[PDB]
């Protein structure tokens, strides 16, 4: 819900999310929904964004309407920040547990230490039930099971109320007598030395000694109880395992790319060379969370968000099968209302008019090839 | 003027209550702005309440307003609760926002978004000022105590959140699991300025070293803000702006 | 008569209006208020921004102009009883200023935190940006200017010169509003981390410190209270 | 400059000048220069890349001592929301102009001193 | 590569620079690489002779709006006009205040008693006119420069 | 003599020394003792430690009780 405002070229060339899947579209309270997919770190990472040396796999959502039970990059849990390598493809998996009823737009996002949020596609997930039914149990290494919704809440309230009461007692003790104007007049007109006299000093000594003694006793008691404590666990985690993708058998060279101002379409001319031994066909163009599909070649079945999915938004001038070894140049047009709804047309406002995306090529048997394209995007006005 | 001695007393009492309201809530606004924009992130999150950065920063930036308000109230009225009123106002504003916005508007649990405790430090600062009225003695000893007692004062609250948990193959504290589970879309984990370990971290010294550094810097900041409050008390009439 | 029930209204108007504002933002925070380019955002928060800015400008102009036009020309021939009554009215103005300062600089400011640190962020005019920067800030600025003008135009102590502590207390917190420019320049460009303790937050803070001039302002009001009707009793 | 001078002469308050006139001084800078630089921002398709006329000027007219990376210009951020770059910068400049004007009023007050430092 | 580029240590790159002669003479032309945090890395330099006249140099370019301009003098007239106009406005303000005596009598008037005599109507009216005209002219010029050149990047 | 105080996890994941050898255990004044071995830079280098872009091969010892005549990484001084 935080994208459509970021720069179009920055959304195009940071991170490409694909193979996204959602386990469920509608859940109950305490029910789990799993989000899977892959993201590729673009080679032409913008210089204004710091390299993803420190990155965190986050969830885009309006507060804890879900709780993040687990999150994985590769196959290993990532509760801390992680290091990503430019040009590598990683697979991710986020497990969410429903907490608050309603209709929520859930995004998978990557926060980069020096570049800000990179928001992936968002999907509407319905939560039904009552928040009062939500439980977040956890078992500690000390052998006790607690609910994270209310654990330590009573202790926190008690201690804060106790110290607030001590301070209020001090202030009220000094506030029983007249406060401002008579004391000001006494201090000004001659030496005061009358508004602070025993047993006021004795009361202050008692307050100070009691404060120190209570702090020490409370710390000792909180050490006898909970004798086993550990510091906060933090630190960027290295050695994220990237996907070992096979080398693509399709090479694509972008010969100019244009978009009409104003308009809802993007046009580019591609020289596609088919290696390997199977006839390929262009089935998809993904630019920034928007999938332009050639419906005659490929159809989406993973429940991709409709406002981000162009079922027939990809038109190829000659999308006949490309025989192996054969090279041809075609005009590819990606047109959909999403191009203007998600403000991908506002790249005219950007200080770097370059686009990047993913082309998905499909053969007859159905196996697909992913190739990455990037080129300057030239607006056309007449 | 005033009719009699009794009516003068009643008028003075009414003025006392109204001026106490004005002082308290102007201090609440200004002190809360300063605190939340100088220590707010650590104060917001239990998984930010660490032993190095939280313990270091919070007393240093929070001794500011108590020093100024003390330098005014004690000097002009012999009222030894400037630090206490500052800390109480900050705690009231923080708790109101935590309950009605952090837990009310958004639905973060209170055990996740509770603020830190500061009344022990405030009481030390006020009593050390009233006894031995020396502002220099206060800045040296009371600010030392204010810095040193911060972490022990908050330990009863945060200690239960530091129980170790075996969470999906990784060791995590309860506060760590809170920060992991309750998603902060705008607050990724790397923003967390917490103790991460160094090659020059010798033994079990992280909390005491941070506490002593905070106490020394609190001495310095109290010394500066005593004179800042001295200036802010000026009753001058700048003839023209 | 002396202190009248204008203090009750001063507290209640801010309390009720800001409770309604909190209800409004609780209802329209999500669901017309998350997406800054949705049409419903324009009808529920951009319209709110426009209406509140126009109403704040009109109210400030009317209130300040009325207070300045009804200024007391013959301050010399003011009885001590009337001076005491005017001092109490000025104290009510200061109470309203303190209440507005609380609502602006504590409640809605830390609501900026809860909001920016949990939402995916989107424009310079998030609903928290409409409520805090452009409603509560302006409201407390108007109240502070009105209190200063009332002191200058009804209290002989605060006449015959501009009080430096009052001017600081009134203008410094006002400088937080133009400091919002540093905020916008302080997230869009410098600092994409939603840190609230970032140096781009210093302009507000620095100018939050100037509210400490309330101490000098209040000792000035105490002296103004204790001019003719200082007692006796006090120091007797 | 005209805004700063007129806002000072009218309402002789230096504080009012520092607040309002400096605000205007900061805000009117870019609109004042827009008639000059607007023709230089016409887009051009230059050898496969999109470039403004000013960009082509900087590219063509070689500055041996001034490479392109030294250029501290807007490059885009992930927190740049919508079409706000110029107004946000203008308002930040206006606020900082208020601050700098306030400081330099007193700096000039000092520089006006007519004191006779008896010995150096 | 009209912008800065990223190079990898240990890699070999091939380059090609196209230069168009502009100024007659004998020039030592170097190919160089400027590094962000290290300064200039100057390659071999070669003497290249340029003959002709600078007045014959042209730098045409065609915009996406369908107009061909010469970069040598494009927008020069507009820049000169606007700068001269604003300089004239400032000079007019200063001269308006400079028709009367300037320094010593005004200093004496300000020092000896309240001045309140050297700034009187219609001086305030002239200043209000200057301020309003400045703001209005800036707004109108911006609007006109937006109607013309409606497409900018 | 300066370890046993550093963090255990930082000592575990920075640099692993193995195949260490010492030419002699007891030496005379002016006599040479050579220390050889291998070290592996751990892939999971902690983020709190800067990457070893600038590193120095040093000797842990109580002042110049020995003088470093030579030091090699790979085969070069
Ligand atoms: C009433 C007077 C008599 C008491 C005197 C107390 C002397 C010190 C006690 C040390 C406790 C302990 O145990 O050592 C220190 C404990 C940790 O201990 P460890 O983990 O075992 O450290 C392992 C190494 N050792 C075995 C050598 C200790 O924490 C600390 O690092 C505290 C460090 C504080 C640094 C800043 C101090 C500034 C002082 C300013 C004065 C105005
Ligand atoms: C005017 C002076 C008033 C001083 C009041 C002191 C009250 C008692 C505190 C016990 C602390 C403790 O138990 O040990 C140190 C622990 C930190 O331990 P940790 O190793 O980080 O582990 C944390 C987990 N625990 C708690 C299960 C072990 O707490 C602190 O960070 C406090 C540091 C400041 C100590 C100040 C006393 C030293 C002399 C001061 C005068 C120069
Ligand atoms: C002029 C100033 C004089 C002050 C004298 C010191 C009074 C100490 C009171 C007891 C504190 C205590 O016992 O607790 C302090 C704890 C010890 O922590 P620990 O050893 O890690 O573990 C907990 C072990 N317990 C449970 C057995 C305590 O926190 C610290 O690490 C702080 C220790 C550094 C103290 C530096 C003092 C330097 C003084 C220099 C004088 C010239
Ligand atoms: C210092 C001078 C301050 C000046 C600024 C004041 C701002 C006022 C609010 C702006 C509203 C806006 O702009 O929005 C207009 C809103 C948009 O809601 P709607 O879509 O019509 O839904 C139906 C309306 N509900 C959602 C509120 C039910 O509707 C309105 O007409 C209602 C606005 C009521 C404001 C007055 C009540 C305040 C509480 C009572 C104690 C005073
Ligand atoms: C106390 C101060 C009160 C000031 C009230 C505001 C007066 C505005 C005059 C018209 C300006 C205009 O219309 O132009 C401003 C342009 C709009 O730009 P645009 O929308 O991107 O595109 C151009 C669209 N046009 C061609 C339709 C204009 O620049 C800006 O972005 C700046 C807008 C931010 C204004 C912030 C004001 C906050 C006031 C808070 C009061 C409590
Ligand atoms: C007379 C005295 C007045 C001087 C003030 C003028 C404003 C300075 C403008 C800086 C531009 C510059 O110098 O460079 C701009 C640099 C270039 O960095 P980058 O490579 O784009 O980094 C990329 C990182 N992003 C993507 C996050 C940008 O961005 C900066 O680091 C901004 C540093 C902050 C400086 C502003 C501090 C204002 C203080 C406010 C406290 C009240
Ligand atoms: C006379 C009184 C009534 C007028 C009140 C004006 C209110 C604001 C108008 C916004 C114009 C607009 O259109 O929005 C803002 C335009 C860009 O617009 P966009 O590209 O559509 O932004 C897309 C997102 N949206 C649809 C939600 C707008 O520029 C800006 O980001 C300006 C940002 C300025 C930040 C600093 C302001 C400091 C103010 C200090 C006060 C003392
Ligand atoms: C005392 C107050 C005087 C204010 C005088 C304003 C004159 C009109 C300016 C129109 C600007 C415009 O047209 O919109 C905004 C544009 C930038 O637009 P851009 O999106 O970056 O694109 C650039 C390309 N253009 C021009 C083809 C779209 O210009 C600016 O950067 C001006 C920003 C400051 C606006 C100040 C007015 C808001 C209220 C101020 C009081 C709080
Ligand atoms: C050389 C530095 C060593 C430390 C001394 C610094 C204190 C100096 C403060 C000062 O200037 O004097 C203010 C008061 C004066 O009160 P007196 O009327 O002198 O009271 C004397 C009786 N008394 C011992 C109970 C205090 O006297 C006091 O401040 C209190 C004196 C008692 C010392 C303990 C008080 C501090 C408690 C934490
Ligand atoms: C952020 C920093 C904190 C701000 C505190 C700085 C205050 C500086 C003191 C000051 O303003 O001096 C006022 C003089 C004008 O003097 P006059 O108007 O002649 O007043 C006569 C008595 N007096 C000279 C002692 C003032 O100088 C002038 O020219 C008048 C300017 C007054 C502006 C002060 C208002 C500050 C609000 C932010
Ligand atoms: C919706 C806005 C309603 C605002 C109503 C403003 C009321 C008019 C202000 C005013 O002049 O005084 C109202 C009261 C009572 O003081 P008055 O005595 O009426 O003021 C003049 C003093 N004089 C009679 C001796 C000449 O003085 C007060 O204490 C009134 C405090 C009101 C709180 C401030 C509200 C501002 C919200 C922006
Ligand atoms: C925006 C930032 C403010 C900058 C701070 C500068 C003002 C600080 C000093 C100050 O408030 O004094 C101005 C007068 C107080 O009386 P004086 O300054 O003695 O002069 C009275 C004659 N005058 C009304 C034309 C100024 O106070 C008034 O007369 C104000 C009431 C009249 C204005 C009402 C019209 C405004 C509608 C928007
Ligand atoms: C509470 C803050 C609200 C804003 C008020 C701040 C202005 C305060 C400036 C000040 O201290 O007073 C200086 C002059 C005094 O001249 P006066 O002899 O009072 O002239 C009154 C007739 N007049 C309305 C045409 C001005 O009076 C003026 O400065 C001009 C007053 C007219 C306001 C508009 C002038 C500013 C134009 C941009
Ligand atoms: C970059 C910072 C800007 C520089 C401004 C700093 C000026 C400091 C004021 C100053 O210089 O004080 C002079 C005194 C010597 O006093 P005397 O020669 O006894 O003069 C008697 C009258 N007086 C005491 C008020 C000066 O102190 C002395 O010992 C004489 C030193 C005079 C050096 C000032 C020349 C500054 C040129 C850069
Ligand atoms: C001193 C500041 C008081 C702030 C209290 C506040 O924000 O109240 C809103 C909150 C809203 O939660 P709730 O009461 O459950 O009502 C929800 C209504 N909305 C969602 C519109 C806020 O609770 C109340 O309305 C209690 C009334 C307190 C009167 C001083
Ligand atoms: C009064 C203390 C001010 C200290 C300033 C500070 O902490 O700045 C941190 C920042 C370091 O940037 P960093 O924290 O790494 O920011 C990471 C996020 N990005 C890269 C988007 C800015 O340094 C600067 O850019 C210069 C600040 C000048 C202050 C007048
Ligand atoms: O002023 C908004 C709070 C912090 C930010 F990260 F969102 F920018
Ligand atoms: Cu969304
Ligand atoms: Cu990619
Ligand atoms: Cu901010
Ligand atoms: Cu050893
Ligand atoms: Cu190893």
TrEMBL record, chain C:
Residues engaged in binding Cu(2+) 2: 183, 187, 201
Stated name of the protein: Ammonia monooxygenase/methane monooxygenase, subunit C family protein
EC number: 1.14.13.25
Keyword flag Lyase: no
Binding, Zn(2+) 1: 112, 116, 129
NCBIfam families according to UniProt: AmoC_BACT, CH4_NH3mon_ox_C
Record gene name: pmoC1
Stretches that traverse the bilayer: 6-24, 44-67, 88-109, 129-151, 163-182, 202-223
Pfam families from the UniProt entry: AmoC
Binding residue positions for Cu(2+) 3: 183, 201
GO molecular function, one term: metal ion binding
Species in which this protein is naturally found: Methylococcus capsulatus (strain ATCC 33009 / NCIMB 11132 / Bath)
Keywords: Membrane, Metal-binding, Monooxygenase, Oxidoreductase, Transmembrane, Transmembrane helix, Zinc
Record-linked InterPro entries: NH3_CH4_mOase_C, NH3_CH4_mOase_C_sf
């Amino acid at each position: 819900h935080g994208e459509k405002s970021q720069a179009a070229f920055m959304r195009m060339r940071t991170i490409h999310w694909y193979d996204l899947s959602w386990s469920k579209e509608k859940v109950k309270i305490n029910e789990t929904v799993e989000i899977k997919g892959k993201f590729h770190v673009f080679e032409g990472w913008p210089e204004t964004v710091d390299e993803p040396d420190v990155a965190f796999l986050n969830v885009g959502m309006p507060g804890p309407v879900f709780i993040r039970k687990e999150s994985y990059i590769g196959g290993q849990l990532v509760p801390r920040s992680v290091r990503l390598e430019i040009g590598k493809t990683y697979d991710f998996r986020v497990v969410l547990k429903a907490r608050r009823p309603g209709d929520w737009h859930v995004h998978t996002m990557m926060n980069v230490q020096g570049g800000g949020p990179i928001i992936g596609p968002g999907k509407w997930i319905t939560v039904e039930g009552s928040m009062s039914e939500f439980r977040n149990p956890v078992t500690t290494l000390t052998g006790q099971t607690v609910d994270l919704e209310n654990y330590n809440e009573g202790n926190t309230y008690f201690w804060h109320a106790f110290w607030f009461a001590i301070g209020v007692a001090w202030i009220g003790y000094w506030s029983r007598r007249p406060i401002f104007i008579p004391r000001l007049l006494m201090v000004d007109a001659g030496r005061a030395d009358e508004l602070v006299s025993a047993t006021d000093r004795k009361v202050a000594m008692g307050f100070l000694a009691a404060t120190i003694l209570i702090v020490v006793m409370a710390m000792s008691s909180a050490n006898s109880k909970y004798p086993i404590t550990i510091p906060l666990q933090a630190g960027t985690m290295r050695g994220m395992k990237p996907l070992e993708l096979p080398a693509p058998t399709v090479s694509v060279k972008v010969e100019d790319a244009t978009y009409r101002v104003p308009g809802r379409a993007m046009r580019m001319k591609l020289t596609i060379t088919n290696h390997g031994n199977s006839p390929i066909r262009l089935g998809e163009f993904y630019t920034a969370s928007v999938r332009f599909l050639d419906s005659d070649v490929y159809k989406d079945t993973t429940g991709y968000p409709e406002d981000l999915l162009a079922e027939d938004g990809l038109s190829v001038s000659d999308n006949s099968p490309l025989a192996p070894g054969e090279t041809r140049t075609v005009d590819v047009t990606a047109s959909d209302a999403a191009w203007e709804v998600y403000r991908l047309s506002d790249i005219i406002y950007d200080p770097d008019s370059r686009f990047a995306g993913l082309l998905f090529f499909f053969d007859a048997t159905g196996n697909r090839q992913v190739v990455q394209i990037d080129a300057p995007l030239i607006p056309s006005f007449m | 003027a005033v009719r009699s001695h009794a009516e003068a007393v009643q008028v003075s009492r009414t003025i006392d209550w109204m001026a106490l309201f004005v002082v308290f809530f102007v201090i609440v606004g200004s002190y809360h702005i300063h605190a939340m924009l100088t220590m707010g992130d650590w104060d917001f999150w239990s998984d930010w309440k660490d032993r190095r950065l939280w313990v270091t920063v919070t007393p240093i930036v929070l001794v500011t307003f108590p020093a100024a308000v003390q330098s005014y109230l004690w000097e002009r009225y012999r009222l030894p609760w400037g630090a206490t009123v500052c800390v109480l106002g900050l705690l009231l504003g923080e708790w109101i926002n935590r309950y009605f916005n952090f837990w009310g508007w958004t639905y973060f649990p209170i055990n996740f978004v509770f603020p830190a405790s500061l009344v022990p430090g405030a009481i030390i600062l006020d009593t050390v000022l009233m006894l031995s009225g020396s502002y220099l003695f206060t800045a040296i000893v009371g600010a030392m105590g204010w810095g040193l007692i911060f972490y022990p004062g908050n330990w009863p609250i945060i200690a239960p959140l530091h129980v170790p948990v075996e969470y999906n193959g990784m060791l995590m504290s309860i506060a760590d699991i809170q920060g992991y589970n309750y998603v902060r879309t705008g607050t990724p984990e790397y923003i967390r300025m917490v103790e991460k370990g160094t090659l020059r971290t010798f033994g079990k010294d992280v909390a005491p070293v941070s506490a002593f550094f905070s106490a020394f810097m609190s001495i310095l900041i109290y010394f500066m803000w005593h004179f800042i409050g001295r200036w802010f008390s000026n009753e001058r009439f700048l003839q023209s702006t | 008569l002396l202190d009248k029930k204008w203090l009750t209204f001063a507290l209640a108007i801010y309390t009720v209006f800001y409770l309604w504002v909190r209800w409004y933002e609780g209802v329209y925070g999500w669901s017309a208020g998350l997406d800054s380019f949705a049409p419903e955002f324009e009808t529920y928060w951009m319209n709110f921004l426009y209406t509140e800015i126009v109403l704040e400008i009109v109210t400030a102009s009317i209130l300040w102009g009325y207070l300045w036009k009804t200024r007391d020309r013959n301050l010399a021939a003011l009885t001590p009883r009337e001076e005491l009554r005017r001092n109490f009215t000025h104290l009510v103005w200061l109470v309203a200023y303190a209440w507005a300062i609380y609502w602006g600089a504590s409640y809605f400011t830390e609501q900026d935190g809860t909001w920016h640190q949990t939402i995916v962020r989107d424009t310079d005019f998030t609903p928290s940006h409409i409520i805090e920067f452009y409603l509560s800030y302006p409201i407390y600025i108007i109240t502070g200017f009105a209190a200063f003008i009332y002191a200058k135009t009804r209290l002989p102590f605060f006449a015959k010169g501009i009080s430096l502590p009052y001017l600081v207390l009134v203008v410094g917190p006002f400088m937080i509003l133009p400091n919002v420019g540093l905020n916008e320049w302080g997230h869009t460009f410098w600092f994409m981390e939603e840190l609230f303790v970032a140096p781009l937050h210093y302009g507000f803070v620095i100018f939050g410190w100037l509210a400490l001039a309330v101490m000098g302002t209040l000792t000035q009001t105490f002296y103004s209270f204790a001019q003719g009707g200082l007692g006796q009793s006090l120091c007797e």
